[PDB]
Amino acid sequence: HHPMTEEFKN
Amino acid sequence: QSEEESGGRLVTPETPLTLTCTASGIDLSKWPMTWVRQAPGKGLEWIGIIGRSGSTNYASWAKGRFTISKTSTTVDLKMTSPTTEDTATYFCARGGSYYDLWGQGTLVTVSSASTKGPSVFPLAPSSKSTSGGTAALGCLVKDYFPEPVTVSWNSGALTSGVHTFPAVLQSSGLYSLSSVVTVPSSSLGTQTYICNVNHKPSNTKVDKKVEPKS
Amino acid sequence: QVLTQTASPVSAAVGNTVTITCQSSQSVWKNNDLSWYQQKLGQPPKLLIYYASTLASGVSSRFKASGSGTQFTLTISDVQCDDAGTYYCVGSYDCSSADCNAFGGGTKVVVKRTVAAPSVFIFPPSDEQLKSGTASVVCLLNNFYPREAKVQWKVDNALQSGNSQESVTEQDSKDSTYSLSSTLTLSKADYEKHKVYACEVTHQGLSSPVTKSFNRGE
């Protein structure tokens, strides 16, 4: 999948 | 660079409901987007998030009852088994870590009660009573359901001295609220005061002229 | 996650300083993914601070904040009337082992000012309403401080109980006062049975209670 930070954090 | 929610309305419990957050001037592939809610008089509550590429996460308390999805111009919140405890204003916001842009919110009411439009009654300025060179007048917006109603004075031109009170839930289950304005007593003869009341849930629109009693 | 904020209200005079604390039940993402918001009734929240100490664009430098891990504080210096409102912290967490985000419970800021007695008005029910079988009598207490106030309703000198409801505005963003409306709801049947309708107001700014009254039909 995608790193959690690139998906959900800004 | 703006958000606007829509779709809030009265539904019976267990009836599914979809809210829409319409984005303007935002590329939704570049931002996590978030839904938050606030029950009347209570605090803000995080519901969930859709990430940049479309993955989703939700609050533990939601128990799968909320689904967020998005298009290139909208973010939806679908609520599947609503209960009365889901009555709230729902906000969409831009951001995943923190929220820099917000919509104005859309109001969801979960109840078995029926829609009812208000009656609008004058609170007539006293013919012989002042409390400081100032008179008071207003409108009473009585027996409506669901929330909300909006009140303006003279189509929004009169704002100074206006107090529109929070709605109270009556024992009947219907709402009432008063909107008042303080004005110079000397103006009562010459100035026209009209309260503009709108209850969109019942398509009720009333412009009521308030004047001293004979 | 639970973020516990300072109990409401935090109070300060204009030009003074307040602080609001936010404790997270677990450490936030990277120890500093914590933001602060101001909200006024009827409006969406406004971002003040992000990453625990970074001032948001266009926000007054009167707002500053700091903290790390589980412990955070927001400081409002040189308090102004329009700081009245509710302030929230938002924690951001590791989505893989927790909820991604959570809100603190909110802390209300009350701007102190001089005591101000209410101006009192009483409004009889309109004839239009009386046609409907109900009578609403309204008592308005305008622009007072502090919020605490007492409204008693009397009908031909008989104290009323259980048939009035009241509502209070948010602290005013320009003069820091409150206003209150009390509505006495009677059946038309009961209303037409009595003469004198009176609102009696007790407030710290009044040396003795103020009564406003009318006689039905006059």
Side-chain angles (χ1 to χ4, degrees), chain A, chain B residues 1-212, chain C residues 1-217:
Chain A
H1 304 318
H2 320 75
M4 193 264 299
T5 58
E6 312 188 4
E7 191 63 4
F8 296 123
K9 304 307 177 188
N10 47 297
Chain B
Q1 48 295 336
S2 68
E3 302 178 53
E4 178 176 321
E5 309 90 339
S6 62
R9 63 202 179 78
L10 173 58
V11 297
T12 58
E14 319 299 320
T15 295
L17 180 59
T18 302
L19 314 182
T20 302
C21 175
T22 301
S24 297
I26 307 162
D27 182 349
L28 292 178
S29 75
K30 304 297 195 293
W31 296 93
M33 301 291 296
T34 298
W35 283 96
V36 177
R37 69 179 191 183
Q38 184 168 45
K42 304 303 199 143
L44 298 158
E45 184 170 43
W46 185 82
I47 301 167
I49 182 168
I50 184 159
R52 288 188 175 82
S53 73
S55 310
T56 55
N57 271 311
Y58 303 96
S60 296
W61 63 257
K63 301 303 197 201
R65 290 183 324 102
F66 295 87
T67 298
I68 301 164
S69 59
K70 65 178 175 180
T71 74
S72 63
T73 64
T74 64
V75 185
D76 281 15
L77 180 69
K78 175 167 207 183
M79 178 175 9
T80 51
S81 284
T83 90
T84 63
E85 280 296 83
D86 297 309
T87 298
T89 291
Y90 287 72
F91 296 99
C92 69
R94 185 176 82 176
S97 293
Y98 64 89
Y99 317 120
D100 66 342
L101 295 185
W102 294 75
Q104 81 288 339
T106 190
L107 189 141
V108 173
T109 304
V110 185
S111 172
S112 284
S114 288
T115 301
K116 186 174 167 315
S119 291
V120 186
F121 305 120
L123 298 166
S126 174
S127 315
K128 294 178 179 179
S129 323
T130 75
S131 272
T134 288
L137 60 96
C139 283
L140 172 63
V141 185
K142 207 187 139 52
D143 296 338
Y144 64 94
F145 195 84
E147 289 254 68
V149 296
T150 64
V151 187
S152 66
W153 285 91
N154 295 343
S155 300
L158 178 53
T159 59
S160 79
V162 171
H163 294 303
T164 297
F165 292 93
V168 299
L169 189 66
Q170 310 172 97
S171 82
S172 66
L174 306 177
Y175 287 96
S176 289
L177 73 66
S178 270
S179 182
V180 302
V181 59
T182 55
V183 301
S185 296
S186 61
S187 89
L188 289 180
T190 80
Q191 177 63 65
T192 284
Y193 296 106
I194 296 163
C195 72
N196 323 109
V197 179
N198 199 2
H199 187 239
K200 290 181 190 195
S202 68
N203 297 125
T204 305
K205 148 143 172 33
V206 169
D207 300 302
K208 177 62 145 253
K209 190 194 201 216
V210 180
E211 40 179 55
Chain C
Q1 300 85 348
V2 164
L3 297 104
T4 294
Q5 300 186 216
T6 304
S8 296
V10 307
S11 295
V14 169
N16 280 5
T17 296
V18 290
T19 67
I20 302 173
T21 297
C22 172
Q23 274 156 246
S24 185
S25 61
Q26 73 187 60
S27 59
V28 297
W29 185 240
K30 296 175 73 223
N31 293 320
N32 67 355
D33 209 7
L34 187 287
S35 50
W36 292 95
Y37 305 80
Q38 176 195 72
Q39 194 185 23
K40 302 195 191 188
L41 184 66
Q43 302 178 12
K46 169 180 152 147
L47 178 68
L48 302 175
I49 295 289
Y50 61 97
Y51 301 151
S53 72
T54 311
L55 195 45
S57 187
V59 172
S60 169
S61 65
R62 289 189 309 103
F63 295 92
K64 81 167 197 230
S66 65
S68 178
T70 59
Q71 306 293 126
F72 300 90
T73 304
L74 173 71
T75 300
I76 312 170
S77 296
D78 191 24
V79 158
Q80 295 302 297
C81 298
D82 70 298
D83 294 336
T86 305
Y87 295 78
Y88 294 87
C89 60
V90 166
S92 166
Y93 302 94
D94 177 19
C95 296
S96 286
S97 293
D99 282 16
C100 293
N101 296 84
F103 283 79
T107 302
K108 181 111 71 195
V109 168
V110 168
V111 178
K112 293 194 196 187
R113 62 163 280 159
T114 58
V115 172
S119 292
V120 187
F121 307 84
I122 191 173
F123 297 102
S126 62
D127 294 332
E128 305 100 283
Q129 182 184 18
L130 294 167
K131 288 191 217 113
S132 71
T134 306
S136 297
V137 196
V138 178
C139 188
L140 170 62
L141 281 63
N142 212 43
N143 297 357
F144 58 94
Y145 185 89
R147 193 169 172 290
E148 189 169 339
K150 190 28 180 146
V151 176
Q152 291 222 126
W153 282 102
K154 287 153 193 203
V155 177
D156 287 332
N157 206 206
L159 173 70
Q160 306 293 294
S161 284
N163 55 354
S164 62
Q165 299 187 278
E166 85 193 11
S167 162
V168 185
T169 53
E170 295 295 281
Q171 188 175 33
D172 189 77
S173 69
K174 302 183 244 223
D175 65 25
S176 303
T177 63
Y178 302 89
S179 298
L180 178 162
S181 70
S182 180
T183 307
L184 174 74
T185 311
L186 307 160
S187 63
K188 197 262 208 73
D190 284 352
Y191 179 70
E192 236 145 62
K193 274 158 46 133
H194 299 269
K195 188 198 212 322
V196 179
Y197 288 86
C199 178
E200 181 200 84
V201 175
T202 309
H203 186 263
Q204 177 184 339
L206 302 169
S207 46
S208 51
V210 165
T211 305
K212 300 301 175 90
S213 66
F214 62 92
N215 298 322
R216 174 174 56 79

